[PDB]
Amino acid sequence: NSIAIPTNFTISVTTEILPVSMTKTSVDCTMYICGDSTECSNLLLQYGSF
Amino acid sequence: NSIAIPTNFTISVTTEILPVSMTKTSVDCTMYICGDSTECSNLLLQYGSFCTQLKRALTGIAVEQDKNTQEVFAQVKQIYKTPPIKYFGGFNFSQILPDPSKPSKRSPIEDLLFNKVTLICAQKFNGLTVLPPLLTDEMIAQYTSALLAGTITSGWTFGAGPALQIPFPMQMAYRFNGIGVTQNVLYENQKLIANQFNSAIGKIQDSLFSTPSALGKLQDVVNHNAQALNTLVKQLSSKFGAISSVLNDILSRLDPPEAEVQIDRLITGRLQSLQTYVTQQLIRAAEIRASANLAATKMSECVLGQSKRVDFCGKGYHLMSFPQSAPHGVVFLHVTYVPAQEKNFTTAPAICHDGKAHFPREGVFVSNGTHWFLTQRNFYEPQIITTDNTFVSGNCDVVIGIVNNTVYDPLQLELDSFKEELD
Amino acid sequence: VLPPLLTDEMIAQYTSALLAGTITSGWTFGAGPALQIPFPMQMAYRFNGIGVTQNVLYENQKLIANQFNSAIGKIQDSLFSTPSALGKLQDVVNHNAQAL
Amino acid sequence: QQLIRAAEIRASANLAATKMSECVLGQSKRVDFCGKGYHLMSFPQSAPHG
Amino acid sequence: YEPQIITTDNTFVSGNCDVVIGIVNNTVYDPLQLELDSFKEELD
Amino acid sequence: VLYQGVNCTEVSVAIHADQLTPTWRVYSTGSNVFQTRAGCLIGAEYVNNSYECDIPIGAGICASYQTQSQSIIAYTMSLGAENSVAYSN
Ligand SMILES: *[C@@H]1O[C@H](CO)[C@@H](O[C@@H]2O[C@H](CO)[C@@H](O[C@@H]3O[C@H](CO)[C@@H](O)[C@H](O)[C@@H]3O)[C@H](O)[C@H]2NC(C)=O)[C@H](O)[C@H]1NC(C)=O
Ligand SMILES: *[C@@H]1O[C@H](CO)[C@@H](O[C@@H]2O[C@H](CO)[C@@H](O[C@@H]3O[C@H](CO)[C@@H](O)[C@H](O)[C@@H]3O)[C@H](O)[C@H]2NC(C)=O)[C@H](O)[C@H]1NC(C)=O
Ligand SMILES: *[C@@H]1O[C@H](CO)[C@@H](O[C@@H]2O[C@H](CO)[C@@H](O[C@@H]3O[C@H](CO)[C@@H](O)[C@H](O)[C@@H]3O)[C@H](O)[C@H]2NC(C)=O)[C@H](O)[C@H]1NC(C)=O
Ligand SMILES: *[C@@H]1O[C@H](CO)[C@@H](O[C@@H]2O[C@H](CO)[C@@H](O)[C@H](O)[C@H]2NC(C)=O)[C@H](O)[C@H]1NC(C)=O
Ligand SMILES: *[C@@H]1O[C@H](CO)[C@@H](O[C@@H]2O[C@H](CO)[C@@H](O)[C@H](O)[C@H]2NC(C)=O)[C@H](O)[C@H]1NC(C)=O
Ligand SMILES: *[C@@H]1O[C@H](CO)[C@@H](O[C@@H]2O[C@H](CO)[C@@H](O)[C@H](O)[C@H]2NC(C)=O)[C@H](O)[C@H]1NC(C)=O
Ligand SMILES: *[C@@H]1O[C@H](CO)[C@@H](O)[C@H](O)[C@H]1NC(C)=O
Ligand SMILES: *[C@@H]1O[C@H](CO)[C@@H](O)[C@H](O)[C@H]1NC(C)=O
Ligand SMILES: *[C@@H]1O[C@H](CO)[C@@H](O)[C@H](O)[C@H]1NC(C)=O
Numbered sequence: 214n215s216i217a218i219p220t221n222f223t224i225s226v227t228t229e230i231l232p233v234s235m236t237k238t239s240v241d242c243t244m245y246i247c248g249d250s251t252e253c254s255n256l257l258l259q260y261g262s263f
Numbered sequence: 264n265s266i267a268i269p270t271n272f273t274i275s276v277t278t279e280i281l282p283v284s285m286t287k288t289s290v291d292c293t294m295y296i297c298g299d300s301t302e303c304s305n306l307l308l309q310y311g312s313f314c315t316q317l318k319r320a321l322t323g324i325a326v327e328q329d330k331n332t333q334e335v336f337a338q339v340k341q342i343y344k345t346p347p348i349k350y351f352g353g354f355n356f357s358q359i360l361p362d363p364s365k366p367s368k369r370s371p372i373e374d375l376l377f378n379k380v381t382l383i384c385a386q387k388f389n390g391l392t393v394l395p396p397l398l399t400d401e402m403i404a405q406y407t408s409a410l411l412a413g414t415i416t417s418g419w420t421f422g423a424g425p426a427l428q429i430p431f432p433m434q435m436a437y438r439f440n441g442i443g444v445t446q447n448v449l450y451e452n453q454k455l456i457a458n459q460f461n462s463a464i465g466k467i468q469d470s471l472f473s474t475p476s477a478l479g480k481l482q483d484v485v486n487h488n489a490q491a492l493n494t495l496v497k498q499l500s501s502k503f504g505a506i507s508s509v510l511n512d513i514l515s516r517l518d519p520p521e522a523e524v525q526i527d528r529l530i531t532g533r534l535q536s537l538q539t540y541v542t543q544q545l546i547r548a549a550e551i552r553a554s555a556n557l558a559a560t561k562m563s564e565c566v567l568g569q570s571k572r573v574d575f576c577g578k579g580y581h582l583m584s585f586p587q588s589a590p591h592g593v594v595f596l597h598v599t600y601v602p603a604q605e606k607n608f609t610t611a612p613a614i615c616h617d618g619k620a621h622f623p624r625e626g627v628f629v630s631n632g633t634h635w636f637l638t639q640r641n642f643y644e645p646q647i648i649t650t651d652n653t654f655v656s657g658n659c660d661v662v663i664g665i666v667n668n669t670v671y672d673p674l675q676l677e678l679d680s681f682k683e684e685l686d
Numbered sequence: 687v688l689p690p691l692l693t694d695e696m697i698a699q700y701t702s703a704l705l706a707g708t709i710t711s712g713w714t715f716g717a718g719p720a721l722q723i724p725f726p727m728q729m730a731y732r733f734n735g736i737g738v739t740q741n742v743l744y745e746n747q748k749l750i751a752n753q754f755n756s757a758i759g760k761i762q763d764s765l766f767s768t769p770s771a772l773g774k775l776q777d778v779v780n781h782n783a784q785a786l
Numbered sequence: 787q788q789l790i791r792a793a794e795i796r797a798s799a800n801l802a803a804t805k806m807s808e809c810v811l812g813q814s815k816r817v818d819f820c821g822k823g824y825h826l827m828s829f830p831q832s833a834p835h836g
Numbered sequence: 837y838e839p840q841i842i843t844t845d846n847t848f849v850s851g852n853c854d855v856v857i858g859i860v861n862n863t864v865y866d867p868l869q870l871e872l873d874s875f876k877e878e879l880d
Numbered sequence: 881v882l883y884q885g886v887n888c889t890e891v892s893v894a895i896h897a898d899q900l901t902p903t904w905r906v907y908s909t910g911s912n913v914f915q916t917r918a919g920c921l922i923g924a925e926y927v928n929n930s931y932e933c934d935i936p937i938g939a940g941i942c943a944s945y946q947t948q949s950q951s952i953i954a955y956t957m958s959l960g961a962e963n964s965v966a967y968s969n
Contacts, residue, residue, distance in 0.1 A: 226757035261501035267721035341963040395939035416965040447850035573812030600719040656741035694805035716811030
């Protein structure tokens with residue numbers, strides 16, 4: 214037969230931090246693998262649509 | 264001291280489209296890398312259990328896709344049916360309920376959804392096969408029909424216990440109380456509400472039929488699976504440094520040693536292509552799983568219940584939702600209450616009568632310029648300020664912005680009507 | 687690296703719009719047209735939401751406003767003082783930098 | 787690695803959007819969804835990538 | 837299921853009888869009037 | 881066994897011609913060959929009776945081990961019992 218009841222209250226503010234987006238990147242596949250090289254690019258073509 | 268209160272409302276129907284399942288694929292690893300070649304298969308054996316891992320990954324994905332469909336649609340204990348008379352208080356559900364006159368027993372909207380999104384694997388038949396779903400389109404349509412019959416005839420009761428019939432207008436009356444609008448608003452305006460609902464459904468059909476991009480979320484899944492398989496097949500034509508992409512030509516012209524070198528080059532390339540395909544399918548499977556789990560959550564909370572979560576079951580205050588089957592997914596029609604035609608009224612936090620502060624029990628105090636009334640928050644309906652509508656706590660001085668107005672106590676006036684003279 | 691489609695100013699404008707809506711209209715603007723309501727009455731309804739009567743807010747309105755203002759000042763002091771408060775975002779920036 | 791990270795960011799963004807709708811544009815009865823205590827209201831703030 | 841007597845405390849009044857579709861005729865008991873009637877109205 | 885993506889006629893012909901690659905053979909007697917959308921199911925007797933799904937096969941068809949002695953039975957899976965709600969005004 215015992216209950217506890219608040220006689221006062223506090224207003225509290227908390228912070229929640231969430232990521233929303235990631236840095237948007239792009240890669241020039243040919244330049245990365247075979248930069249400024251025609252011969253490498255021609256060999257790269259034999260690997261298909263990677 | 265200014266509050267705006269709706270004097271009218273609109274019943275709105277919105278469409279949410281979610282993927283549920285992905286095309287189930289399987290790959291014959293040996294046939295893809297080393298098709299009809301014993302020598303290549305023997306070299307492939309030296310790479311260990313890569314084909315076994317690829318097979319387990321694709322099997323797990325296929326099982327997961329059947330799990331996703333089962334979890335989203337098989338949420339009803341029994342297959343419920345509507346009465347033979349499709350009369351529900353004046354609400355017309357004929358466009359969402361199954362049409363008995365056509366094969367597959369789908370609703371007009373489901374047929375539109377199936378026609379907009381586009382057995383024997385004649386294409387890509389290079390060791391790559393597609394498995395059928397465990398549940399057929401008819402079985403999914405039957406689950407959707409059962410969910411609609413349950414919602415329409417029993418409201419939310421069938422989703423948390425046995426199905427209990429309730430007249431549809433009373434189901435709406437309870438849904439109105441849920442959003443925070445009294446029952447008399449629905450009953451006095453029942454015809455308007457039924458007409459707005461029927462109009463909104465017709466608009467849903469016109470919107471989905473007219474706009475080719477309405478179902479892009481599902482078409483993107485179909486297109487991404489098609490691209491993944493077209494790429495995987497296209498990679499077979501690559502040489503990867505070999506003299507030829509065809510194993511039969513390598514074996515036809517070269518002796519075993521040189522053939523083994525050229526074959527190892529092709530095995531490495533094809534194995535890399537399969538590993539990339541499976542990894543991409545696992546990532547896509549995770550995305551589809553998340554979507555299917557969201558669709559199942561929405562099915563449970565929007566269709567089998569009523570949700571207080573803002574924007575979870577469409578924009579506006581949620582009343583109810585109706586599922587529709589779609590290829591590789593589910594479409595939810597969310598029926599919400601949207602406030603309309605607001606008017607600006609003066610307000611006050613409390614009314615002073617005789618030194619006491621009166622606060623609304625269920626409502627807001629408003630003033631039409633000259634007279635104070637109590638109204639419900641979401642629908643203008645002025646009522647006389649009384650001791651039954653308000654409660655008393657504290658004195659007049661404590662409340663900031665309190666105004667002076669009469670609070671009518673029906674008891675005292677009734678007593679005064681009974682003669683006080685006695686003689 | 688491609689820029690975001692929305693600039694930091696555009697995101698700030700969306701945040702400002704959301705704050706103005708919440709402060710001046712409560713939840714009404716998020717499920718229909720925006721309807722103005724005095725802020726103390728918005729709080730009174732929020733108190734009824736948690737299950738506390740309106741008179742608690744109105745009799746204690748000054749205490750509640752003071753506690754709110756104090757809590758906000760504490761938020762600024764907490765975020766400014768602690769360098770790790772935003773680690774969840776810095777980890778994303780750092781992981782992208784490490785990957786590249 | 788970027789695809790896996792993108793999936794994690796998507797899940798975070800979907801949680802942030804759910805919280806925006808239920809905490810800022812409404813009032814939520816979900817315990818600990820909108821902070822500790824009984825929820826009254828929430829205010830968004832912009833942050834880099836979140 | 838817990839049947840209770842229809843009273844002015846259990847229900848609220850809004851609008852007239854004609855507007856509601858499917859409304860039925862039944863007595864709504866107002867405890868106040870009966871209590872008043874118990875207190876003698878004759879006075880003499 | 882289930883031969884996926886193939887017609888039962890093609891499998892039967894391949895069996896009679898001794899062309900099918902696996903060297904084992906299922907008895908494949910009368911009533912044990914059933915055409916499904918998933919493929920050709922050999923070694924299970926299809927029954928019209930619908931039961932809850934046990935071992936999934938595909939395209940709505942499931943199989944289980946049942947007493948009818950016992951054998952493997954193929955069937956179209958049941959979705960649930962029917963319950964017509966006594967709806968009225
Ligand atoms: C519930 O609504 C449906 C429609 O949403 C009512 O059924 C009838 O549906 C057809 C749809 O084609 C309506 O238009 C018809 O179009 C064809 C051409 O497509 C035309 O040749 C017909 O003359 C007709 O215009 C049709 O008007 C509609 N019926 C009525 C009376 O409007 C269904 O009757 C509704 N149920 C109830 C109980 O009102
Ligand atoms: C609350 O808003 C609804 C509409 O959202 C109001 O009902 C609408 O009332 C107008 C005028 O009475 C109707 O227009 C009329 O329609 C008939 C159709 O035959 C036409 O012949 C007339 O010439 C006129 O165009 C409108 O159809 C009706 N809408 C619906 C869905 O019933 C309602 O009166 C508003 N209530 C208040 C208190 O403002
Ligand atoms: C419920 O709790 C609140 C605080 O959480 C109580 O209010 C607080 O009351 C104390 C004493 O009256 C205040 O302290 C005083 O502050 C003034 C500021 O100028 C200072 O000069 C005094 O010497 C003393 O330190 C305290 O500031 C105040 N807090 C707030 C936020 O107003 C409230 O009285 C409690 N109510 C009950 C019924 O217990
Ligand atoms: C505010 O509302 C009150 C009552 O709802 C209006 O008072 C009534 O006005 C009509 C006008 O035709 C009279 O017939 C009634 O007899 C009036 N009743 C009372 C008790 O005064 C009042 O006019 C409204 N004021 C505004 C500005 O809208
Ligand atoms: C509501 O009415 C009360 C009186 O019933 C007003 O209280 C009076 O306010 C005047 C202001 O000059 C004082 O001089 C009187 O002594 C007050 N009398 C009492 C009994 O308190 C009260 O101000 C009115 N409130 C409003 C907003 O008009
Ligand atoms: C409820 O009772 C009222 C009378 O108190 C009924 O109203 C009468 O209905 C008959 C129908 O033929 C009319 O001829 C009378 O003129 C009506 N009188 C009044 C005062 O309205 C009402 O129909 C009853 N409702 C039901 C459902 O029985
Ligand atoms: C609100 O109504 C008042 C009059 O009651 C009017 O002066 C004010 O311009 C209105 N505001 C809007 C935004 O309609
Ligand atoms: C199998 O072949 C027969 C040949 O007559 C044809 O009728 C039947 O439809 C085919 N079934 C499938 C599933 O290909
Ligand atoms: C409900 O009322 C309508 C009124 O037109 C009637 O047609 C319908 O048959 C009634 N339903 C039942 C179950 O009696």
